[PDB]
Paper text:
The human type 1 insulin-like growth factor receptor (IGF-1R) is a homodimeric, disulphide-linked (αβ)2 receptor tyrosine kinase implicated in normal human growth and development. IGF-1R is closely related to the human insulin receptor (IR): their ectodomains share 53% sequence identity, their respective monomers can form functional heterodimers and both receptors can bind all three ligands within the family (insulin and the two insulin-like growth factors, IGF-I and IGF-II), albeit with varying affinities. To address these issues and gain understanding of the mechanism of ligand binding, we have determined crystal structures of apo- and IGF-1-bound forms of IGF-1RΔβ, the latter intriguingly obtained via crystal soaking.
Crystals of the complex of IGF-I with the Fv-bound IGF-1RΔβ were obtained by soaking IGF-I directly into crystals of the receptor ectodomain/Fv complex. Incorporation by soaking of IGF-I into the apo crystals is remarkable, and is presumably facilitated by the crystal’s high solvent content (~75%). Difference maps revealed IGF-I bound to the single site 1 within the asymmetric unit, in a fashion effectively identical to that seen in liganded-μIR structures, allowing its ready incorporation into the atomic model. Analysis of the structure reveals that IGF-I binding is accompanied by a separation of the IGF-1-bound L1-CR module away from domain FnIII-2΄, this displacement being effected largely by a “hinge” motion close to the junction between domains CR and L2. Conformational changes are seen in both the αCT΄ helix and IGF-I upon IGF-I binding to site 1 of IGF-1RΔβ. Upon IGF-I binding, αCT΄ remodels, its helix now spanning residues 688–701, i.e., αCT΄ unwinds by one turn at its N-terminal end and extends by one turn at its C-terminal end. IGF-I residues Tyr24 and Phe25 are displaced from the core of the growth factor, with the side chain of IGF-1R αCT΄ residue Phe701 now locating into volume originally occupied by the side chain of IGF-I Phe25. The side chain of IGF-I Phe23 undergoes rotameric re-arrangement to bury in a largely hydrophobic pocket formed by the side chains of domain L1 residues Asn11, Leu33, αCT΄ residue Phe701 and IGF-I residues Leu14, Gln15 and Cys18, as well as by the main chain atoms of IGF-I residue Tyr60. No interpretable electron density is apparent for IGF-I B-domain residues 27–30 nor C-domain residues 31–38, the only C-domain residues in interpretable density thus being residues Pro39, Gln40 and Thr41. The fact that binding can occur within the crystal suggests that the ligand binding process is one of induced fit that results not only in conformational change in the ligand and the receptor site 1 elements, but also in the concomitant separation of domain L1 from the adjacent FnIII΄ domains.
Author numbering:
A (entry chain B), F (entry chain B): 4 to 26, 39 to 63
B (entry chain L): 1 to 107
C (entry chain H): 1 to 118
D (entry chain A): 1 to 35, 41 to 153, 162 to 189, 193 to 644, 689 to 705, 745 to 807
E (entry chain A): 493 to 590
Write the structure that this text describes.
């Protein structure tokens, strides 16, 4: 499971130059760090 | 929602007369009724704010009244410029609703 | 010196989307909310939504939520009223109202005629 | 030029261009995940917090915001007004014009190339210097903090103060809020000054700001907006909160312009710009887009949770379900006013409408065809409405229709229209006795209890023999018993015939011998517990006479005999001083009676005999005995990334669960036995002991040599 | 009318699978009324179903007789098995590589 | 919570010279080590 600075490294790797979208604190840590998430779930945190 | 029913559908008036329009609401509204004048081939213009208080710009001929479910718009001296459609707007709750329109045509 | 200028008349076939511009001038564009009113015929004036130019939030009429979409452009001082899946009933004259508040609509735009032709 | 109410720049380096005109940023500012030269001398004030995170290429903050003077921090990011986290290539905080941070603290973390941290005296820029967090940066021993000015005392040291390698840390003289070079600003000013002691020549105003003037309190016809400026009445009449179904404009209250009325306030009617003080718990009106809310399941009723007034219509159609009476009562138990009508159709699971407790008003804006506001139909198990002589109800307009409700006695709905106030409003076919009250047993006989015998867990209770009204009727009994804390117990608390919500049911047959009367033995009951018991008769009539009678008994409240209490819970002990031991505990799990007092015991424990034998000049370790950043990274990640859609001594403690033992040998182990008695512990005996071991404090200076 | 529908993997489905009138063990029940216009026939729209899934559906009539004739009749329909249309599959689960 | 050799030290201390009784592997570790148990529960593992 990805957590902390190790997580945001994979997030910047998956999105790459695409970026991250932005626009109830059960966030990505409670999704990809508390539990195991695949890279398809990570990619949905990127931009269009 | 809330519906506004304006009593006189059309009013055949000659210039110089004194006429009074009516606009009744389903629900009770202390003020929050606003009148709009719209001549032919134009955009509606505000006449009276909150049932009574007027707007700087409109002539002193127009005057509003009423409270609750009964409201009145009175043109004390109807002129050749005041001939057109009239509306009342409800604004106490959502959504904002208008009246059916009272046409002030020439007699 | 307050004034609202809307787009020109439009005539489009059913099922297509369209938007109507409305540029403000003579007043602080960010200090006043912008209303939108539909006039299908001279009898029915239908308020369809307000947008707050400060924060960008909106409040729609329930009969136009799945139909209309109100946006704003702070830099250009222009609001937009998008209408998708147009049908013959939406053929109306839409007005741009502002320089007031969420309660009254002091000034109105000249109006934009939308016609849905077969 | 005000920019807001929130700037969030990320991904694109060129997206930072949105700050080209902004001199004040209303709200927070986010510069995240950024990968050339951009200068913004316009920006000077930031109302909320400033966040920087993983910005590659940026070497100093002075490259972007050189004129940033005040970070007011009106709203904080995890109690921080400035967060510089994981900033690579960043070398120094180049905010050489930063003067005052009004509220929160600072968190500068994980900046391997950041210098000039100790060269900044944060004690004159912010107030809560104790709650700052500067960890994980470039170590000051491995940097080179060099100035190209003034200095003061930092911690216990005195050293120079500089922001970067070219600019120093600017400070005001002791005579003053000052300008560029030694001239005090206005008292209402903050930071720098375009001109000395002038209201219209201030880079940032303290308190509030209006029409170019630093004003202490807002002018009379202006109100507080955000936390730095004042706006008029027409401005907040144009603001609109975040879009929702119940999203409205902003309110004016206490001279402030907030998003929603504060706790304990509600919006006034018509004049919806001000908040009126509601005295009780202010209502939570629920407005749904669908005209008639249909409750066909417990999952569908979930949307009505916590509602006080319901703007709409209620259609109850619950065929199947789980434990429903206790579930709907969680959601719909708070509904008090229904604007429209209420229809209970095909609700076979409902035996009672008691889940609609606080419902005291039904209006009638919309009524079913025929002008009906209360309409029930085909409820095969509805034995009773929620209309018992305790609840109130008022139907303002509409009629009531009752049909095909067999278990509902027709007399119960005649009693309804008395409180409802619609006695002669309905027609003759609206309430008919043909298909209603068909299987209902209204007038019933009375079963009389005869004797009760109570122990600590068993209850023997007998009732008189019951001869049925007909000779042919087969007779049986059913015992309803449940634990009731107090007496307000109704017979209807379940659902359908499967509602195991409360009453435990046991079917006992009439004894064969006519000399012995029917009874029941209850086994496995909690000691000293009040139980509600009543017996119902099962009269299976061979001749199905619709003059149904039946037999039902009175609610009898029986409490079992007291027993030995449970052991005290969680015995903790500590030693604040020598010869003293403080002990605290919790009440027992099963008190089994009224708690009277606690009995604590402490016994001296002997010192270890094995300790005295060994030679400890050879052993290396001598025995000693005793007395008595991730969580922030999770918050930063959960907010940034949004996805797209010896003898015993004995004492009695009279009241409290805490006591202090006195007069003890210092640094000596003690066994602490604690008992729990009750009102019947004089005969039964006090409870067992939940014991703990604690050692006192060492006598200071008593283990040294007492002579020359 | 009352519509009984539930997801059935295969056809051996009996109408009795619950308990009392609260047995929500299996059948989902929706009460649809007879339409006012006599030209349109009664129907129901089911929403939120799993793609490519066989559903057992049958309709029962609710005849509230004003004259309680103990010659009870009622109306009940045949068990109809209906499978929804296929859709885009889900993503593969737990991709591991070495 | 007491676990391992630390646990059997407290068990020999509580029982002392009394001993341990002896005469479904959810034992004392799943009682006093997995969860917190008080000394009254420990004493019930001794002899009469
Ligand atoms: C369970 O607890 C119940 C109470 O919660 C017990 O019921 C109680 O039982 C006692 C004895 O059976 C009964 O009598 C009490 O009051 C009498 C009147 O004061 C008293 O008799 C006095 O006079 C005698 C001579 O006249 C004298 O010899 C005697 O010593 C007394 O001075 C009697 O001794 C006793 O004090 C209670 O009335 C009764 N309470 C209730 C509410 O029913 C029950 O027995 C307990 N059962 C078990 C199995 O433990
Ligand atoms: C920055 O300016 C603010 C202005 O409010 C100062 O806030 C003061 O805070 C203390 C403690 O809460 C109050 O007693 C004062 O009344 C506040 N000042 C005013 C003018 O109201 C804050 O101390 C300043 N910080 C620095 C480092 O100068
Ligand atoms: C900022 O000012 C420029 C003019 O220099 C203008 O084009 C732009 O729309 C303004 N606003 C933003 C957000 O850039
Ligand atoms: C009985 O009434 C009291 C006081 O209103 C309340 O605390 C208690 O919960 C009620 N009983 C039940 C079973 O709700
Ligand atoms: C139907 O029968 C098959 C074979 O006996 C069995 O696998 C299946 O579980 C049955 N259906 C149900 C609902 O039990």
């Amino acid at each position: 499971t990805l957590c902390g600075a190790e997580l945001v490294d994979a997030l910047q790797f998956v999105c790459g130059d695409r970026g991250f979208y932005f626009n109830p604190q059960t966030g990505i840590v409670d999704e990809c760090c508390f539990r195991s998430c695949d890279l398809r779930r990570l990619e949905m945190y990127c931009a269009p | 929602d809330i519906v506004l029913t304006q009593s006189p559908a059309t009013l055949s008036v000659t210039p110089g007369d004194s006429v009074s329009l009516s606009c009744r609401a389903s629900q009770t509204i202390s003020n929050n009724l606003h009148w709009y004048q719209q001549k032919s081939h134009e955009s509606p213009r505000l006449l009276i704010k909150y049932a009574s208080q007027s707007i700087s710009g409109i002539p002193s001929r127009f005057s509003g009244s009423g409270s609750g479910t009964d409201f009145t718009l009175s043109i004390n001296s109807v002129e050749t410029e005041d001939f057109g459609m009239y509306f009342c707007q409800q604004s106490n709750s959502w959504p904002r609703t208008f009246g059916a329109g009272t046409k002030l045509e020439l007699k | 010196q307050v004034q609202l200028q809307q787009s020109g008349p439009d005539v489009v076939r059913p099922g297509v989307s369209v938007k109507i511009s409305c540029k403000g001038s003579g007043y602080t564009f960010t200090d006043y909310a912008i209303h939108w009113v539909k006039q299908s015929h001279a009898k029915s004036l239908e308020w369809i939504g307000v947008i707050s130019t400060y924060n960008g939030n909106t409040k729609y009429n329930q009969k136009f939520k799945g139909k209309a979409a109100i946006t704003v452009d702070k830099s250009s001082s222009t609001a937009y009223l998008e209408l998708a899946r147009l049908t013959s009933e939406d053929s109306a004259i839409y007005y741009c109202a502002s320089y007031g508040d969420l309660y009254v609509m002091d000034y109105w735009g000249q109006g934009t005629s939308v016609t849905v032709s077969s | 030029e005000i920019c807001g109410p929130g700037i969030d720049i990320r991904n694109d380096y060129q997206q930072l261009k949105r700050l080209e005109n902004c001199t004040v940023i209303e709200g927070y500012l986010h510069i995240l995940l950024i990968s050339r030269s951009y200068r913004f001398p316009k920006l000077t004030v930031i109302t909320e917090y400033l966040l920087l995170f993983r910005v590659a290429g940026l070497e100093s903050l002075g490259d972007l915001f050189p004129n940033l003077t005040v970070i007011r921090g009106w709203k904080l990011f995890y109690n921080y007004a400035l967060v510089i986290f994981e900033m690579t290539n960043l070398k120094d905080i180049g905010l050489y014009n930063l003067r005052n941070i009004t509220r929160g603290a600072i968190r500068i973390e994980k900046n391997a190339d950041l210098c000039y941290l100790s060269t900044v005296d944060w004690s004159l820029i912010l107030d809560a210097v104790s709650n700052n967090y500067i960890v994980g940066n470039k170590p000051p021993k491995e940097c080179g903090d060099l100035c190209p000015c003034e200095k003061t005392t930092i911690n216990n040291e005195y050293n120079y103060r500089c922001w970067t390698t070219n600019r120093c840390q600017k400070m005001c003289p002791s005579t003053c809020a000052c300008t560029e070079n030694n001239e005090c600003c206005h008292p209402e000013c903050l930071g720098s000054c375009s001109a000395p002691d002038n209201d219209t020549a201030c880079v940032a105003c303290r308190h509030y700001y209006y029409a170019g003037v630093c004003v202490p309190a807002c002018p009379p016809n202006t109100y507080r907006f955000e936390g730095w400026r004042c706006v008029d009445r027409d401005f907040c009449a144009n603001i609109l909160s975040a879009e929702s179904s119940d999203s409205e404009g902003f309110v004016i209250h206490d001279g402030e312009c907030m998003q929603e009325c504060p706790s304990g306030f509600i919006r006034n009617g018509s004049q919806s710009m001000y908040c009126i003080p509601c005295e009780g718990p202010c209502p939570k009106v629920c407005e749904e887009e669908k005209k008639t809310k249909t409750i066909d399941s417990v999952t569908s009723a979930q949307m009505l949770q916590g509602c006080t007034i319901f703007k709409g219509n209620l259609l109850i159609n619950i065929r199947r379900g789980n434990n429903i009476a206790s579930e709907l009562e969680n959601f719909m138990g708070l509904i008090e006013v229904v604007t429209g009508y209420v229809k209970i159709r095909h609700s076979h699971a409902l035996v009672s409408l008691s889940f609609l407790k606080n419902l005291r008003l039904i209006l009638g804006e919309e009524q079913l065809e025929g002008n009906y506001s209360f309409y029930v139909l085909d409820n095969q198990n509805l034995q009773q409405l929620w209309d018992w002589d305790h609840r109130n109800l008022t139907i303002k307009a509409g009629k009531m229709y009752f049909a095909f409700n067999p278990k509902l006695c027709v007399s119960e709905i005649y009693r309804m229209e008395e409180v409802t106030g619609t006695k002669g409003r309905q027609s003759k076919g609206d309430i008919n006795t043909r298909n209603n009250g068909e299987r209902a047993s209204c007038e019933s006989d009375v079963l009389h209890f005869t004797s009760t015998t109570t122990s600590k867990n068993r209850i023997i209770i007998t009732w008189h023999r019951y001869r049925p009204p007909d000779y042919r009727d087969l007779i049986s009994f059913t015992v309803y018993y449940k634990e009731a804390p107090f007496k307000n117990v109704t017979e209807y608390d379940g659902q359908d015939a499967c509602g195991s919500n409360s009453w435990n049911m046991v079917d006992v047959d009439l004894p064969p011998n006519k000399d012995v009367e029917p009874g029941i033995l209850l086994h496995g009951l909690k000691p000293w517990t009040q139980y509600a018991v009543y017996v119902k008769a099962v009269t299976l009539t061979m001749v199905e006479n619709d003059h149904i009678r039946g037999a039902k008994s009175e609610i009898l409240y029986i409490r079992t005999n007291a027993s030995v209490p449970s052991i005290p819970l969680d015995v903790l002990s500590a030693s604040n001083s020598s010869s003293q031991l403080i002990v605290k505990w919790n009440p027992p799990s099963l008190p089994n009676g009224n708690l009277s007092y606690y009995i604590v015991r402490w016994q001296r424990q002997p010192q270890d005999g094995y300790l005295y034998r060994h030679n400890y000049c050879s052993k290396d370790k001598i025995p000693i005995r005793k007395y008595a950043r991730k969580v922030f990274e999770n918050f930063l990640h959960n907010s940034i990334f949004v996805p797209r859609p010896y003898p015993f001594f004995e004492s009695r403690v009279d009241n409290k669960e805490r006591t202090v033992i006195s007069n003890l040998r210092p640094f000596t182990l003690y066994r602490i036995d604690i008992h729990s008695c009750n009102h019947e512990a004089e005969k039964l005996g006090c409870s067992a002991s939940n014991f703990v071991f604690a050692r006192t404090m060492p006598a200071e200076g008593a283990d040294d040599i007492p002579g020359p």
